[PDB]
Amino acid sequence: SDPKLTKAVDSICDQFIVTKSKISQLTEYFIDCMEKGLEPCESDISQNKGLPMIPTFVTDKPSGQEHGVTMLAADLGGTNFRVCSVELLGNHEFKIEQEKSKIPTFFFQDDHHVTSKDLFQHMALITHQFLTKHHKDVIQDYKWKMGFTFSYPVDQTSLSSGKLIRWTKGFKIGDTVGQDVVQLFQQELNDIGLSNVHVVALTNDTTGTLLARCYASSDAARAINEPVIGCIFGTGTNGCYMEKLENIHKLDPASREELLSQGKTHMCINTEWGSFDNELNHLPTTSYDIKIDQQFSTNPGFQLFEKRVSGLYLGEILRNILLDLEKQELFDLKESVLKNNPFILTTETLSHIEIDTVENDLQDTRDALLKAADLETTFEERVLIQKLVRAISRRAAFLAAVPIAAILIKTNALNQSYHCQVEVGCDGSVVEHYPGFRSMMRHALALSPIGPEGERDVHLRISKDGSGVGAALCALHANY
Amino acid sequence: SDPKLTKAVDSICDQFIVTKSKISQLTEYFIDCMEKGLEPCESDISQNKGLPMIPTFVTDKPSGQEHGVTMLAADLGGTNFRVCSVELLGNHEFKIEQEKSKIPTFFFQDDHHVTSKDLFQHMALITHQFLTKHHKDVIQDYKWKMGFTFSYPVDQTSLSSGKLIRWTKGFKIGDTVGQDVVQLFQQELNDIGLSNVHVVALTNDTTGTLLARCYASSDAARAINEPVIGCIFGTGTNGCYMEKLENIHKLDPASREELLSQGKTHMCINTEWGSFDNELNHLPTTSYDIKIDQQFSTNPGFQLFEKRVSGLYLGEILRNILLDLEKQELFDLKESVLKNNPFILTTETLSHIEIDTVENDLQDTRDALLKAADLETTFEERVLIQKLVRAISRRAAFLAAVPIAAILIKTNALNQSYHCQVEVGCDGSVVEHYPGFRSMMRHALALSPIGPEGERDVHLRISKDGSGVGAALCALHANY
Ligand SMILES: OC[C@H]1O[C@H](O)[C@@H](O)[C@@H](O)[C@@H]1O
Numbered sequence: 001s002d003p004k005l006t007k008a009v010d011s012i013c014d015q016f017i018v019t020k021s022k023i024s025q026l027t028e029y030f031i032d033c034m035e036k037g038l039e040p041c042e043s044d045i046s047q048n049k050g051l052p053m054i055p056t057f058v059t060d061k062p063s064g065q066e067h068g069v070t071m072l073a074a075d076l077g078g079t080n081f082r083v084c085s086v087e088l089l090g091n092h093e094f095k096i097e098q099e100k101s102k103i104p105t106f107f108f109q110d111d112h113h114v115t116s117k118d119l120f121q122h123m124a125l126i127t128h129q130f131l132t133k134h135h136k137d138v139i140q141d142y143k144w145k146m147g148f149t150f151s152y153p154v155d156q157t158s159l160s161s162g163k164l165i166r167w168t169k170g171f172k173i174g175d176t177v178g179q180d181v182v183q184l185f186q187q188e189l190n191d192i193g194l195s196n197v198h199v200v201a202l203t204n205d206t207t208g209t210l211l212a213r214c215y216a217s218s219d220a221a222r223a224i225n226e227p228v229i230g231c232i233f234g235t236g237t238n239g240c241y242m243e244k245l246e247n248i249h250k251l252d253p254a255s256r257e258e259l260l261s262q263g264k265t266h267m268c269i270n271t272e273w274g275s276f277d278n279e280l281n282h283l284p285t286t287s288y289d290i291k292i293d294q295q296f297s298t299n300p301g302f303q304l305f306e307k308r309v310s311g312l313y314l315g316e317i318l319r320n321i322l323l324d325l326e327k328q329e330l331f332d333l334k335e336s337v338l339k340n341n342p343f344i345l346t347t348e349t350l351s352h353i354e355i356d357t358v359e360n361d362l363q364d365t366r367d368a369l370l371k372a373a374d375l376e377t378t379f380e381e382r383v384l385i386q387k388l389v390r391a392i393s394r395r396a397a398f399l400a401a402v403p404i405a406a407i408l409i410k411t412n413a414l415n416q417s418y419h420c421q422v423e424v425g426c427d428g429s430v431v432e433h434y435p436g437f438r439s440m441m442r443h444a445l446a447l448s449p450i451g452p453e454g455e456r457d458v459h460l461r462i463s464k465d466g467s468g469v470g471a472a473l474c475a476l477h478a479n480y
Numbered sequence: 481s482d483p484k485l486t487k488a489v490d491s492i493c494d495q496f497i498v499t500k501s502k503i504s505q506l507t508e509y510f511i512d513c514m515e516k517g518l519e520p521c522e523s524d525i526s527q528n529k530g531l532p533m534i535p536t537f538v539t540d541k542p543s544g545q546e547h548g549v550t551m552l553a554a555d556l557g558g559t560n561f562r563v564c565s566v567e568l569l570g571n572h573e574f575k576i577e578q579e580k581s582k583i584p585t586f587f588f589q590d591d592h593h594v595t596s597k598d599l600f601q602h603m604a605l606i607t608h609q610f611l612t613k614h615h616k617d618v619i620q621d622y623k624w625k626m627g628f629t630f631s632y633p634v635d636q637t638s639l640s641s642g643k644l645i646r647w648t649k650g651f652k653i654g655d656t657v658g659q660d661v662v663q664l665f666q667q668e669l670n671d672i673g674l675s676n677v678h679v680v681a682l683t684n685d686t687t688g689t690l691l692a693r694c695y696a697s698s699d700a701a702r703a704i705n706e707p708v709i710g711c712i713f714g715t716g717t718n719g720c721y722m723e724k725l726e727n728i729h730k731l732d733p734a735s736r737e738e739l740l741s742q743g744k745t746h747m748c749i750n751t752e753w754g755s756f757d758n759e760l761n762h763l764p765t766t767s768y769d770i771k772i773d774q775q776f777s778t779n780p781g782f783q784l785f786e787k788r789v790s791g792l793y794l795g796e797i798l799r800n801i802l803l804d805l806e807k808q809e810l811f812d813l814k815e816s817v818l819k820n821n822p823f824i825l826t827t828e829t830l831s832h833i834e835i836d837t838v839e840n841d842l843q844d845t846r847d848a849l850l851k852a853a854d855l856e857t858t859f860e861e862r863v864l865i866q867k868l869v870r871a872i873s874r875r876a877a878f879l880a881a882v883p884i885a886a887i888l889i890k891t892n893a894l895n896q897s898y899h900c901q902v903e904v905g906c907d908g909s910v911v912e913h914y915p916g917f918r919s920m921m922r923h924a925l926a927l928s929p930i931g932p933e934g935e936r937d938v939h940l941r942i943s944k945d946g947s948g949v950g951a952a953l954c955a956l957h958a959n960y
């Protein structure tokens with residue numbers, strides 16, 4: 001046992017603590033950033049470093065009674081692409097067939113130049129494969145309507161149009177920025193004989209999650225828990241909510257009055273809260289966060305909240321900590337492959353360490369670290385690595401509660417009726433599968449200004465239904 | 481409006497308040513009663529006024545991988561009888577066919593003499609009708625094993641034997657007390673030609689609820705939430721938990737060592753917490769509670785906790801309050817049928833009042849009161865009636881949390897591993913369908929000694945699986 005190392009680890013773990021006062025600060029600051037983000041854009045939307053707060057042009061929360069013929073949906077996430085067909089049967093029920101495939105590594109590597117046509121041709125081809133397998137008899141005949149879930153910031157101009165503001169996560173395809181992604185996708189669909197497939201809706205994965213929960217929640221369950229947020233804690237992190245039209249001052253005033261006259265009162269806002277406090281005025285920041293933001297990430301200066309929370313980055317934080325402890329001659333990295341191998345340690349690796357037990361000599365930690373980077377470890381080394389992992393994930397979970405607390409506070413969502421609660425629909429591998437992440441989120445909600453009595457009125461529900469149902473709901477509404 | 485009536489109602493509502501100090505007192509007192517209840521009693525088990533704390537002789541929580549041929553199950557509740565066949569397919573999955581039938585009124589009336597043979601003959605015929613409908617080709621051939629879920633206190637002597645301690649709810653069949661209900665049931669099965677149906681297990685509906693959740697809970701869901709309590713909040717209320725063998729002092733000391741030598745460490749305990757504090761040393765008590773216990777209930781002096789909590793009695797509490805307000809010449813009962821009609825107001829009636837809205841002039845309340853007893857009401861009267869209902873249900877929900885907090889504290893269940901949470905499997909119409917009952921239970925848990933941090937670690941989950949899966953699991957284990 002090396003006491004000098006144990007004290008160094010304990011001091012690093014302390015850096016990741018987020019106090020109740022910090023949660024209070026970040027909550028009020030987040031609301032401030034929400035209000036500034038709702039004001040008319042000063043600079044160019046692609047270079048604006050504030051909270052994006054992007055109007056989605058979705059104003060109606062599904063009732064659950066929507067019904068229609070089979071819709072198509074395509075969902076480009078941070079890690080996978082999936083095509084599915086959704087049949088909305090009404091009465092909160094649907095039939096879904098889907099195919100999920102990992103985004104080929106070719107699209108995340110910059111060694112060779114990659115273009116938008118490569119990506120959307122690949123997406124179009126998989127769409128063809130899907131229709132061949134599940135709808136072989138009507139692939140080329142039917143007038144398919146498709147909803148496109150695009151989990152990236154888009155300068156939305158209507159339900160069916162919007163230009164990519166900037167890539168996030170692992171994408172760095174240059175020529176896509178500033179282009180309408182619905183058109184890029186439609187062109188590649190046309191060129192392989194699927195011109196009968198009309199992409200008629202474009203949604204963020206947050207928007208789709210909220211719409212899907214509004215539909216599938218039973219009349220009884222929804223009368224108790226009204227869905228008010230659709231958010232994501234997977235490869236990246238983000239969330240949406242319903243904002244009063246009058247407060248969306250960046251929206252064209254005449255368009256606002258038109259919507260208000262039509263009976264609409266709110267529009268869904270894609271906060272893009274991964275880019276909360278990109279200037280680091282208040283977010284906790286360690287030396288490891290700086291190296292991830294400035295050297296190892298594809299988007300330096302953006303998505304900084306996300307770089308402390310989402311699954312793409314938690315494992316890389318551990319890597320930067322271990323490299324620092326080895327530079328100080330406190331931790332022996334052996335013949336591992338950690339050096340010069342960014343993102344080799346994944347959040348999935350960490351998920352095997354979070355609740356590993358010392359009664360098993362932390363063997364899951366031993367096996368997981370050997371599999372990821374061939375890092376052999378002693379028991380005392382694993383004990384200390386577990387302390388670090390638990391500090392990284394707790395900070396991620398505590399920060400994860402801040403945007404939710406802020407939205408609920410700003411919209412006075414908890415001021416309801418007797419026995420009335422709100423649902424926060426959550427999707428993504430971290431919130432769903434990382435041991436304890438949700439529990440720690442709820443702790444941070446209880447420390448937040450909404451208090452423990454507020455946390456009990458909030459239900460973080462895993463919406464594994466998917467944003468495909470949400471995209472399908474938008475396609476049902478739209479015209480072919 | 482009516483100031484004198486408003487002040488009387490507001491004063492009654494205050495009498496139903498349960499404070500944090502009371503919850504703490506009742507929680508610690510409940511633990512004391514658990515410990516006294518685990519000591520060997522020498523008195524008549526039917527006359528003991530303490531917490532029964534009945535060993536169930538169930539020592540093994542299912543793994544979820546249990547599999548076998550189709551088992552039978554019989555479930556006598558407080559309101560319905562159901563027979564069902566359960567096919568355990570392993571991997572937390574099962575196939576179930578069931579038939580549910582209401583217990584005939586004949587068994588709840590005392591005008592005509594009722595005997596155990598009447599009850600168990602009728603159950604034998606229903607079992608025959610079930611096997612004729614769903615297993616017509618092997619009714620008389622197969623060597624059926626049946627699990628018997630009997631939701632009443634039983635002096636359990638093995639998994640397959642136990643004498644009725646006393647009826648509860650609406651049952652008062654005299655000659656059943658002191659008789660092995662498995663033998664009574666088996667005799668009538670033999671006597672209608674179903675001697676090939678062997679009743680091989682006898683469980684309380686609490687025990688069955690816990691065993692069912694242990695089986696159906698996925699390995700992943702169960703690794704985060706370990707089921708530690710199976711409880712009921714329906715017609716009656718009760719719960720079970722796993723107690724260390726060493727603490728079950730009423731068990732034969734030699735039998736304890738035999739079980740311990742076999743690798744067993746715990747045995748499920750049927751607390752029978754409906755009979756918590758039958759002597760009213762600390763339970764809140766109103767004049768209305770006394771009238772229910774001494775005049776309108778079948779079992780005066782027993783099940784007093786239950787008579788403040790469970791669905792059989794909540795509506796009757798309101799009736800007795802209105803009769804007192806009419807006795808005081810403050811409320812006009814008009815031409816209603818409340819007088820001399822005990823239990824005419826049901827907990828179902830109250831469920832329509834709990835979340836009725838003034839925006840509808842409380843029309844759900846008006847219709848529910850007219851449907852039940854032809855009680856015409858004004859809007860201002862309904863405003864006050866709603867306050868009474870909300871006071872009755874909150875007191876029920878707050879008291880409902882006390883046994884759960886007590887069990888978790890006694891067994892030190894919430895602080896076991898990092899990220900440690902527990903599942904409390906709840907079944908019954910009240911907890912499942914009464915608006916806000918679970919929400920208010922969680923409030924009371926947070927006020928209890930486990931605190932808000934404890935409540936966040938407790939998952940009150942609705943167990944719609946049923947005690948049939950639980951009974952089937954016991955029958956699969958048992959020998960034909
Ligand atoms: O995938 C989650 C989330 O990741 C990033 O933060 C952004 O690309 C968002 O648009 C997206 O919703």
Ligand SMILES: OC[C@H]1O[C@H](O)[C@@H](O)[C@@H](O)[C@@H]1O
Pocket residue numbers: 558631632633648649684685686712715716717718719752754783786
């Ligand atoms: O049915 C729930 C519960 O009701 C009463 O309290 C008793 O009959 C218990 O034996 C039973 O478990």
